[PDB]
Design a protein around this ligand. Structure first.
Ligand code: SF4
Ligand SMILES: [Zn+2]
Ligand SMILES: [Zn+2]
Ligand SMILES: [Zn+2]
Ligand SMILES: [Zn+2]
Lengths: 752, 383
């Protein structure tokens, strides 16, 4: 409908509206009018994406500032869902206003999801797709073909047609979801990737991952095209701290350094060949480096660095080269002795946990290498690779690795740590030493986002506690509130199972994963659930080796044979193509009434993004708490830094992370208040963690279900599914769970 | 911090914690009749062809319905066939079970209640087993409803107590074929809301989600049957507006037994077909000489009442002056039923009829509205 919040005409694309949705819109408009940070959890079920999209389009069109809108999600599954909801909302707004207004909206992802080249489309890696698409379109190949038309080098017609048509005429006005965008670019023979990369400054909305905002290696080009005074929305912003961690984290193995030695030797051979043939490119590169010209001063806009900048752009050094790495051979020797120093550093029999300052002091006392030449390592290496004009870059990837490590550990000294450990897996017979350069402070990658932008929306369906995140990230909110979603009848039934059918306490600790009693209890409850679940299951466990051991044990003991009678069994696979095939197989088996059970990682690919609405999720079997591996040294480093700086207890953060992964798994089952589904939690340690739960989840959890065994939980589920199968009374839900236009107007008059 | 025994006694005697009792039930009665206050003559499917799909599976061995699911469903299906032939005699009925992964047609489509009851009691003896498949049952129903004429409505009922169906092919193609063949489907599941059955009921019945019903207890199942006997209202876009040629046979009377045209057996009675003078055993049956739907006036008589649904009797306010002390149709004295002297007069048991302004009691209302189908007040009015 079309209603007013203050002076804002809101074109809601549904004939009805939830009350929680409208109070959410009131709070969001208050936040936008005030300006600043805000953390709000909007319960899953109720429409979240379309409501934000409606308020942002109303705010952008109506207000004379016309600030652009930034919408950051976690996966392009959710980005595509948002684009589809935006397509519906723009169709509604065009229908109501009678015209298609001036509006641009696109989603943003990698080349691998946006490559229409028929030859380079079967590659299993995005890196090889990027290196080929650069190789032909760095501009070196085009000018070579201009100079030599008989050259065997090839160009992508999809990119070359983009030069013919004007920038603003790449697409017609409106929204293009990735399916529609790929269909249009297939019809028009265009590259969608370069189109999206060129519409960043022109789109009213651009939707990209947290990687395209937090990780500077790809966000460096993105953030230069967006508006500083733009409204930013963080959707599903509950694992954004994890993304901030991996944005500034790094790992290297001894195979990587062996390939680094091989790449350094190949680079030495290549530079010897260049010095033999033509040293003029080396010469003018040398004088450009003497002049102090940086990489961006010499690299063209249509080409990218060979190794991307791993650090924040505000943390980069604006001064010239120190000159030690200015010559090509000098830089080659410099990087080779980097490789040998780090190789020497791996020969150790215990854990090394030292600060970057301690590492650089050990560096400067073992070799003569300073922080400042390392702070230009990636830039110098990328410039050298560009000026060498090497045809293949397959052998130089470990050079990217070592340049990234050098720049990352040089520029950064606080909030970071280096972990050198001899057994990368403790099950390996032969020692395989590892180094881990980790980012202790998760607030670093989100700090320039808060510095640049003014109005920030942080939102997850299941984020709890609300004040936990202003502690881990140094920012201040203007308001935090959690909504209790109201029901005519209780649509969701959460349980806690603490013991099996024989009242033996069940636990998912990794040391007791092979307990026959606990595994047998788990098999018993899943068999009974598969006997009583109508449509479909998703089942979450803590770890991948946990499914491997436990389904090996039930397949040995014949539980899964009995499961095969009722539902088709689907398991998450590390091959994400096979995992997506299993996912669509599961959805097909849920659609036709075949019945299916999905076994997944609670911290994995299926847990994020993928929603099990309606028949896709009816019972959410939570086997155990998805705790991380505590003995992993990186997690202990997390806990130590949080306790030292932000005064957060180790068990508190451990439990919080485990149950927030549990909660993001639980929130994928409800879409709409007509959707129903239970969230059963099978571990003895969930019983003490109700106070941490999401508030809409917490109000649905009764006192009687805090400690149940299998059988009365099964009876409660049976009664619940008999209850929600009944047709509800519209008079029971006419104005208390959903509002029409008249109910919303009446409540607006009551509030006034 | 002690054991469960060392705390306290249960105090079960103190657990029980302890004229306006009329209103506490009668306001519930108003709330129950609130859903039934809307009534209008819907055009419904009068000539019907029902396919009763029966689950015959290991899920029918479940110990939730007494004594198993199988016996209660088979006896309630016997009851359903009896009452449906008592309310819709001109219809043609086929019975099918779903057993061992194949849809077993246990009786052909027919207008004989007795043969279908015999088929049901024959299936009553056997043990339900196998994994049920919906798609086989819907394909069999599609086959058997193919010779059904355009005027006769194609209808299918399924009692699917299982939760999963294992189909040999795509069931959505079968759903599209049934929608294309204008076959309306109502599904009566026993355990939960199966999504494929929900989609089947929505698509086959023109977007209506109210045709997928799940019981709550023992009595609600019989409620599902006795509102399943009702003719379904047809959609406005359905144009099967035809004339149907049928004749009225006369009961022949003879002391000499003669060969009936249907069975070739000696029957003293019979009904001579007006088109070709052929005798049959039972009515309403088709004439097996000239394919004529031989009937009685009683068979269409049983179906007039759906076309004239009685408007619900509106109970008079207690404040307004009552018309008479006794009821109209049974002249039972209306109970004074005064709660107290301060409790005043509540729940006046007089049910007015809007077309005749005649009051009726509660027993008269609950007799006139389903057993009778006329208002005696509307008939005493000299129009
Ligand atoms: S130019 Fe576009 S279509 Fe061609 S390879 Fe690169 S991303 Fe793919
Ligand atoms: Zn006969
Ligand atoms: Zn005849
Ligand atoms: Zn009476
Ligand atoms: Zn009357």
């Amino acid at each position: 409908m079309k209603f007013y919040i203050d002076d804002l005409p809101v074109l809601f694309p549904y004939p009805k509206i939830y009350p929680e949705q409208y109070n959410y819109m009131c709070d969001i408009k208050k936040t936008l009018d005030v300006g600043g940070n805000s953390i709000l959890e909007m319960p899953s079920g109720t429409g979240k994406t379309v409501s934000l999209l409606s308020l942002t389009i109303a705010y952008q069109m109506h207000y004379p500032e016309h600030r652009k809108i930034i919408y950051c999600s976690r996966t392009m599954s959710e980005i595509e869902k948002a684009l589809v909801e935006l397509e519906n909302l723009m169709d509604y707004r065009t229908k109501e206003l009678g015209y298609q207004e001036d509006f641009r909206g696109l989603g943003l992802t990698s080349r691998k999801n946006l490559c229409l080249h028929p030859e380079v489309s079967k590659e299993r890696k995005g890196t090889v797709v990027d290196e080929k698409c650069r190789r032909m379109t760095n501009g070196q190949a085009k000018r070579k073909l201009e100079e030599d038309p008989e050259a065997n080098v090839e160009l992508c017609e999809y990119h070359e047609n983009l030069y013919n048509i004007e920038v603003e005429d790449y697409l017609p006005k409106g929204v293009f979801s990735f399916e529609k965008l790929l269909k249009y670019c297939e019809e028009k023979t265009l590259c969608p990737y370069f189109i999206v990369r060129r519409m960043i400054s022109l789109c009213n909305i651009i939707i990209y991952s947290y990687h395209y905002l937090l990780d500077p290696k790809i966000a460096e080009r993105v953030s230069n095209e967006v508006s500083k005074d733009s409204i930013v929305i963080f959707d599903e912003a509950h694992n954004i701290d994890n993304v901030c961690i991996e944005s500034l984290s790094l790992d290297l193995t001894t195979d990587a350094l062996r390939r680094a030695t091989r790449g350094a030797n190949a680079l030495d051979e290549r530079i010897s060949e260049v010095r033999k043939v033509d040293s003029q490119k080396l010469q003018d590169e040398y004088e450009k480096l003497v002049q102090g010209l940086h990489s961006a001063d010499i690299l063209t806009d249509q080409e990218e660095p060979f190794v991307e900048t791993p650090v924040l752009p505000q943390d980069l050094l604006t001064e010239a080269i120190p000159g030690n790495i200015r010559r090509a051979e000098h830089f080659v020797s410099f990087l080779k002795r980097l490789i040998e120093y780090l190789k020497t550093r791996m020969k150790v029999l215990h854990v090394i946990s030292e600060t970057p300052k301690s590492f650089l002091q050990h560096l400067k006392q073992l070799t003569f290498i300073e922080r400042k030449p390392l702070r230009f390592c990636s830039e110098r290496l990328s410039l050298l690779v560009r000026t060498l004009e090497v045809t293949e870059v397959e052998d130089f990837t470990a050079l990217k690795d070592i340049a990234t490590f050098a720049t990352l550990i040089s520029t950064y000294e606080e909030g970071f740590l280096l972990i050198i450990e001899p057994y990368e897996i403790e099950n390996a017979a032969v020692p395989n030493p590892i180094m881990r350069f980790t980012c202790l402070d998760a607030s670093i990658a989100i700090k320039p986002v808060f510095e640049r932008f003014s109005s920030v929306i942080i939102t997850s369906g299941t984020i709890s506690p609300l004040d936990m995140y202003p502690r881990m990230l140094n920012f201040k909110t203007v308001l935090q509130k959690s909504y209790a979603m109201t029901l005519a009848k209780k649509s969701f039934l959460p349980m806690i199972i603490t013991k099996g059918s024989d009242q033996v306490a069940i636990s998912s600790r990794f040391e007791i994963r092979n307990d026959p009693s606990i595994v047998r209890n788990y098999g018993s409850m899943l068999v009974e659930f598969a006997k009583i679940t109508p449509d479909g299951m998703v089942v979450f466990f803590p770890s991948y080796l946990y499914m491997e051991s436990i389904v090996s044990m039930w397949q040995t003991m014949g539980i899964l044979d009995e499961v095969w009678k009722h539902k088709l069994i689907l398991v998450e696979t590390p091959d994400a193509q096979e995992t997506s095939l299993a996912l669509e197989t599961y959805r097909k088996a849920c659609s036709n009434g075949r019945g299916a059970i999905l076994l997944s990682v609670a911290r994995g690919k299926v847990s994020e993004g993928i929603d099990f609405d309606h028949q896709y999720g009816r019972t959410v079997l939570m086997i155990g708490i998805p705790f991380q591996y505590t003995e992993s040294r990186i997690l202990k480093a997390r806990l130590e830094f949080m306790r030292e700086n932000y005064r957060i207890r180790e068990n508190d953060f451990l439990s919080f992370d485990a149950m927030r992964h549990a909660a993001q798994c639980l929130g994928r089952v409800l879409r709409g208040k007509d959707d129903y589904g239970v969230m059963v939690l099978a571990d003895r340690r969930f019983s003490r963690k109700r106070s941490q739960l999401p508030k809409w989840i917490a109000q649905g959890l009764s006192d009687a279900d805090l400690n149940l065994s299998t059988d009365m939980a099964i009876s409660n589920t049976k009664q619940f599914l008999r209850t929600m199968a009944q047709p509800t009374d519209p008079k029971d839900q006419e104005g208390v769970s959903v509002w029409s236009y008249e109910d919303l107007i009446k409540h607006q008059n009551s509030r006034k | 911090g002690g054991y469960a025994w060392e705390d306290e006694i249960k105090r079960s005697w103190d657990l029980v914690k302890v004229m306006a009792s009329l209103v506490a039930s009668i306001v519930e009665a108003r709330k129950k009749r609130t859903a039934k206050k809307n009534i209008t003559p819907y055009q419904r499917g009068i000539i019907r062809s029902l396919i009763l799909t029966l689950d015959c599976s290991e899920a029918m061995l479940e110990k939730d319905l007494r004594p198993n699911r199988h016996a209660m469903i088979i006896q309630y299906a016997i009851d359903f066939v009896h009452e449906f032939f008592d309310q819709n005699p001109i219809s043609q009925m086929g019975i099918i079970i779903m057993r061992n992964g194949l849809a077993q047609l246990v009786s052909q489509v027919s207008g004989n209640p007795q043969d279908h009851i015999d088929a049901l009691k024959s299936i009553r003896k056997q043990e339900p087993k196998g994994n049920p498949s919906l798609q086989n049952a819907l394909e069999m129903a599609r086959g058997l409803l193919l010779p059904v004429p355009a005027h006769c409505t194609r209808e299918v009922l399924i009692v699917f107590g299982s939760l999963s169906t294992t189909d040999p092919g795509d069931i959505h193609q079968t759903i599209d074929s049934l929608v294309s063949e204008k076959i309306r489907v109502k599904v009566l599941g026993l355990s939960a809301q199966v999504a494929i059955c929900k989609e089947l009921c929505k698509a086959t019945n023109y977007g209506d989600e109210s045709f997928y019903k799940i019981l709550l207890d023992e009595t609600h199942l019989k409620e599902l049957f006795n509102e399943a006997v009702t003719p379904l209202p047809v959609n406005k876009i359905n144009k099967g507006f035809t004339l149907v040629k049928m004749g009225f046979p006369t009961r022949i009377f003879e002391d000499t037994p003669t060969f009936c045209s249907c069975h070739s057996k000696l029957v003293y009675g019979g009904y001579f077909c007006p088109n070709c003078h052929s005798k049959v055993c039972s009515l309403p049956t088709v004439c097996p000489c000239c394919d004529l739907m031989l009937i009685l006036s009683t068979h269409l008589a049983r179906s007039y009442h759906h076309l004239m649904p009685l408007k619900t009797f509106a109970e008079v306010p207690t404040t307004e002056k009552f018309r008479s002390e006794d009821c109209f149709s049974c002249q039972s004295r209306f109970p004074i039923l005064k709660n107290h002297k301060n409790g005043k007069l509540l729940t006046s048991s007089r049910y007015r009829c809007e077309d005749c302004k005649q009051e009726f009691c509660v027993d008269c209302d609950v007799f006139i509205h389903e057993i009778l189908h006329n208002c005696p007040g509307c008939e005493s009015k000299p129009v």
